[PDB]
């Protein structure tokens, strides 16, 4: 639609910080450690995590909201692809994605 403004970036920071404070965000705060899953980086071609997104927000990496949403969606898509549906990581991804949608709707409403 329209490119992100400085005021949009304040809203992105608020959304990201809300995700980072969520109780079920613990699997996604930092990159997957190869010890957590030895074949992870051979299976997942574009890893993503919230610390990486935080660095990108601080550097003003994102020009459009769709790019920020795409990175967030990678976090959850990676998790559901690698893990079976009974895994605690998978369950966390389901909870946090629905929370992100709720926060995303609020962000778009405030624009
Ligand atoms: C660093 N941090 C430590 C706790 C959990 C881990 N997150 C994982 C680990 N393994 N797998 C398979 C995953 O999908 C995720 Cl999100 C990342």
PDB file of C-alpha atoms and ligand atoms in Angstrom:
ATOM      1  CA  UNK A   1       0.000   0.000   0.000  1.00  0.00           C
ATOM      2  CA  UNK A   2       2.283   2.778   1.379  1.00  0.00           C
ATOM      3  CA  UNK A   3       5.849   2.793   2.759  1.00  0.00           C
ATOM      4  CA  UNK A   4       6.656   2.718   6.458  1.00  0.00           C
ATOM      5  CA  UNK A   5       7.107   6.087   8.181  1.00  0.00           C
ATOM      6  CA  UNK A   6       9.021   7.037  11.305  1.00  0.00           C
ATOM      7  CA  UNK A   7       5.720   6.860  13.198  1.00  0.00           C
ATOM      8  CA  UNK A   8       5.072   3.414  11.727  1.00  0.00           C
ATOM      9  CA  UNK A   9       8.435   2.315  13.103  1.00  0.00           C
ATOM     10  CA  UNK A  10       7.419   3.290  16.631  1.00  0.00           C
ATOM     11  CA  UNK A  11       4.425   0.989  16.213  1.00  0.00           C
ATOM     12  CA  UNK A  12       6.598  -1.827  14.856  1.00  0.00           C
ATOM     13  CA  UNK A  13       8.844  -1.489  17.920  1.00  0.00           C
ATOM     14  CA  UNK A  14       5.818  -1.727  20.205  1.00  0.00           C
ATOM     15  CA  UNK A  15       4.597  -4.859  18.400  1.00  0.00           C
ATOM     16  CA  UNK A  16       8.028  -6.497  18.465  1.00  0.00           C
ATOM     17  CA  UNK A  17       8.500  -5.733  22.164  1.00  0.00           C
ATOM     18  CA  UNK A  18       5.060  -7.220  22.887  1.00  0.00           C
ATOM     19  CA  UNK A  19       6.030 -10.429  21.117  1.00  0.00           C
ATOM     20  CA  UNK A  20       9.326 -10.576  23.010  1.00  0.00           C
ATOM     21  CA  UNK A  21       7.531 -10.257  26.371  1.00  0.00           C
ATOM     22  CA  UNK A  22       5.006 -13.005  25.619  1.00  0.00           C
ATOM     23  CA  UNK A  23       5.344 -16.114  27.759  1.00  0.00           C
ATOM     24  CA  UNK A  24       5.243 -18.358  24.686  1.00  0.00           C
ATOM     25  CA  UNK A  25       7.887 -16.398  22.778  1.00  0.00           C
ATOM     26  CA  UNK A  26      10.746 -18.193  24.550  1.00  0.00           C
ATOM     27  CA  UNK A  27      11.589 -20.537  21.584  1.00  0.00           C
ATOM     28  CA  UNK A  28      11.875 -17.595  19.179  1.00  0.00           C
ATOM     29  CA  UNK A  29      13.814 -14.916  21.045  1.00  0.00           C
ATOM     30  CA  UNK A  30      17.231 -15.940  19.655  1.00  0.00           C
ATOM     31  CA  UNK A  31      18.359 -18.011  16.652  1.00  0.00           C
ATOM     32  CA  UNK A  32      17.956 -21.777  16.869  1.00  0.00           C
ATOM     33  CA  UNK A  33      21.112 -23.256  18.356  1.00  0.00           C
ATOM     34  CA  UNK A  34      22.539 -26.134  16.269  1.00  0.00           C
ATOM     35  CA  UNK A  35      22.630 -28.131  19.524  1.00  0.00           C
ATOM     36  CA  UNK A  36      18.847 -27.770  19.889  1.00  0.00           C
ATOM     37  CA  UNK A  37      18.408 -29.562  16.542  1.00  0.00           C
ATOM     38  CA  UNK A  38      21.543 -30.745  14.713  1.00  0.00           C
ATOM     39  CA  UNK A  39      19.991 -30.873  11.215  1.00  0.00           C
ATOM     40  CA  UNK A  40      18.011 -27.622  11.582  1.00  0.00           C
ATOM     41  CA  UNK A  41      20.144 -25.456   9.305  1.00  0.00           C
ATOM     42  CA  UNK A  42      20.245 -28.132   6.615  1.00  0.00           C
ATOM     43  CA  UNK A  43      16.440 -28.342   6.687  1.00  0.00           C
ATOM     44  CA  UNK A  44      15.455 -24.678   7.131  1.00  0.00           C
ATOM     45  CA  UNK A  45      16.911 -22.532   4.384  1.00  0.00           C
ATOM     46  CA  UNK A  46      15.887 -19.116   5.782  1.00  0.00           C
ATOM     47  CA  UNK A  47      16.033 -19.184   9.589  1.00  0.00           C
ATOM     48  CA  UNK A  48      14.482 -16.266  11.410  1.00  0.00           C
ATOM     49  CA  UNK A  49      14.102 -15.132  15.020  1.00  0.00           C
ATOM     50  CA  UNK A  50      12.945 -12.106  17.000  1.00  0.00           C
ATOM     51  CA  UNK A  51      16.464 -10.868  17.796  1.00  0.00           C
ATOM     52  CA  UNK A  52      17.191 -10.754  14.071  1.00  0.00           C
ATOM     53  CA  UNK A  53      13.990  -8.799  13.494  1.00  0.00           C
ATOM     54  CA  UNK A  54      14.912  -6.418  16.320  1.00  0.00           C
ATOM     55  CA  UNK A  55      18.258  -5.673  14.667  1.00  0.00           C
ATOM     56  CA  UNK A  56      16.437  -5.135  11.378  1.00  0.00           C
ATOM     57  CA  UNK A  57      13.935  -2.731  12.973  1.00  0.00           C
ATOM     58  CA  UNK A  58      16.748  -0.772  14.668  1.00  0.00           C
ATOM     59  CA  UNK A  59      18.590  -0.468  11.328  1.00  0.00           C
ATOM     60  CA  UNK A  60      15.364   0.556   9.508  1.00  0.00           C
ATOM     61  CA  UNK A  61      15.704  -2.492   7.264  1.00  0.00           C
ATOM     62  CA  UNK A  62      11.975  -2.656   6.457  1.00  0.00           C
ATOM     63  CA  UNK A  63      10.496  -0.334   3.834  1.00  0.00           C
ATOM     64  CA  UNK A  64       7.008  -1.904   3.679  1.00  0.00           C
ATOM     65  CA  UNK A  65       4.821  -3.512   6.331  1.00  0.00           C
ATOM     66  CA  UNK A  66       4.540  -6.654   4.192  1.00  0.00           C
ATOM     67  CA  UNK A  67       8.310  -7.176   4.591  1.00  0.00           C
ATOM     68  CA  UNK A  68       8.035  -7.070   8.387  1.00  0.00           C
ATOM     69  CA  UNK A  69       5.061  -9.455   8.320  1.00  0.00           C
ATOM     70  CA  UNK A  70       6.940 -11.821   5.988  1.00  0.00           C
ATOM     71  CA  UNK A  71       9.866 -12.091   8.423  1.00  0.00           C
ATOM     72  CA  UNK A  72       7.512 -12.737  11.356  1.00  0.00           C
ATOM     73  CA  UNK A  73       5.657 -15.360   9.335  1.00  0.00           C
ATOM     74  CA  UNK A  74       8.959 -17.115   8.526  1.00  0.00           C
ATOM     75  CA  UNK A  75       9.565 -17.652  12.262  1.00  0.00           C
ATOM     76  CA  UNK A  76       6.293 -19.562  12.591  1.00  0.00           C
ATOM     77  CA  UNK A  77       6.384 -21.268   9.181  1.00  0.00           C
ATOM     78  CA  UNK A  78       9.901 -22.574   9.895  1.00  0.00           C
ATOM     79  CA  UNK A  79       8.787 -23.875  13.263  1.00  0.00           C
ATOM     80  CA  UNK A  80       5.729 -25.728  11.957  1.00  0.00           C
ATOM     81  CA  UNK A  81       7.687 -27.217   9.036  1.00  0.00           C
ATOM     82  CA  UNK A  82      10.547 -28.536  11.150  1.00  0.00           C
ATOM     83  CA  UNK A  83       8.562 -29.696  14.166  1.00  0.00           C
ATOM     84  CA  UNK A  84       5.667 -32.146  14.469  1.00  0.00           C
ATOM     85  CA  UNK A  85       2.350 -30.760  15.644  1.00  0.00           C
ATOM     86  CA  UNK A  86       2.798 -32.297  19.114  1.00  0.00           C
ATOM     87  CA  UNK A  87       6.111 -30.503  19.744  1.00  0.00           C
ATOM     88  CA  UNK A  88       6.138 -27.738  22.400  1.00  0.00           C
ATOM     89  CA  UNK A  89       7.797 -25.440  19.837  1.00  0.00           C
ATOM     90  CA  UNK A  90       4.905 -26.027  17.423  1.00  0.00           C
ATOM     91  CA  UNK A  91       2.384 -25.275  20.169  1.00  0.00           C
ATOM     92  CA  UNK A  92       4.244 -22.058  21.011  1.00  0.00           C
ATOM     93  CA  UNK A  93       4.211 -21.065  17.340  1.00  0.00           C
ATOM     94  CA  UNK A  94       0.426 -21.468  17.187  1.00  0.00           C
ATOM     95  CA  UNK A  95      -0.130 -19.328  20.290  1.00  0.00           C
ATOM     96  CA  UNK A  96       2.313 -16.598  19.337  1.00  0.00           C
ATOM     97  CA  UNK A  97       1.164 -16.345  15.720  1.00  0.00           C
ATOM     98  CA  UNK A  98      -2.411 -15.712  16.825  1.00  0.00           C
ATOM     99  CA  UNK A  99      -1.079 -13.084  19.256  1.00  0.00           C
ATOM    100  CA  UNK A 100       0.898 -11.446  16.463  1.00  0.00           C
ATOM    101  CA  UNK A 101      -2.213 -11.308  14.292  1.00  0.00           C
ATOM    102  CA  UNK A 102      -4.072  -9.589  17.136  1.00  0.00           C
ATOM    103  CA  UNK A 103      -1.265  -7.051  17.555  1.00  0.00           C
ATOM    104  CA  UNK A 104      -0.900  -6.645  13.781  1.00  0.00           C
ATOM    105  CA  UNK A 105      -4.583  -5.749  13.431  1.00  0.00           C
ATOM    106  CA  UNK A 106      -4.130  -3.128  16.139  1.00  0.00           C
ATOM    107  CA  UNK A 107      -1.077  -1.686  14.391  1.00  0.00           C
ATOM    108  CA  UNK A 108      -2.898  -1.394  11.065  1.00  0.00           C
ATOM    109  CA  UNK A 109      -5.885   0.254  12.765  1.00  0.00           C
ATOM    110  CA  UNK A 110      -3.661   2.921  14.333  1.00  0.00           C
ATOM    111  CA  UNK A 111      -1.977   3.833  10.999  1.00  0.00           C
TER     112      UNK A 111
HETATM  113  C1  LIG B   1      17.919 -20.435  21.450  1.00  0.00           C
HETATM  114  N1  LIG B   1      16.849 -20.864  21.719  1.00  0.00           N
HETATM  115  C2  LIG B   1      16.926 -21.796  22.831  1.00  0.00           C
HETATM  116  C3  LIG B   1      15.529 -22.371  23.193  1.00  0.00           C
HETATM  117  C4  LIG B   1      14.808 -22.974  22.058  1.00  0.00           C
HETATM  118  C5  LIG B   1      15.374 -22.734  20.729  1.00  0.00           C
HETATM  119  N2  LIG B   1      14.269 -22.659  19.762  1.00  0.00           N
HETATM  120  C6  LIG B   1      14.097 -23.860  18.918  1.00  0.00           C
HETATM  121  C7  LIG B   1      14.990 -25.026  19.147  1.00  0.00           C
HETATM  122  N3  LIG B   1      14.813 -26.220  18.320  1.00  0.00           N
HETATM  123  N4  LIG B   1      13.761 -26.272  17.283  1.00  0.00           N
HETATM  124  C8  LIG B   1      13.623 -27.451  16.505  1.00  0.00           C
HETATM  125  C9  LIG B   1      12.858 -25.132  17.061  1.00  0.00           C
HETATM  126  O1  LIG B   1      12.014 -25.151  16.237  1.00  0.00           O
HETATM  127  C10 LIG B   1      13.045 -23.921  17.895  1.00  0.00           C
HETATM  128 CL1  LIG B   1      11.978 -22.510  17.652  1.00  0.00          CL
HETATM  129  C11 LIG B   1      16.241 -21.440  20.520  1.00  0.00           C
END
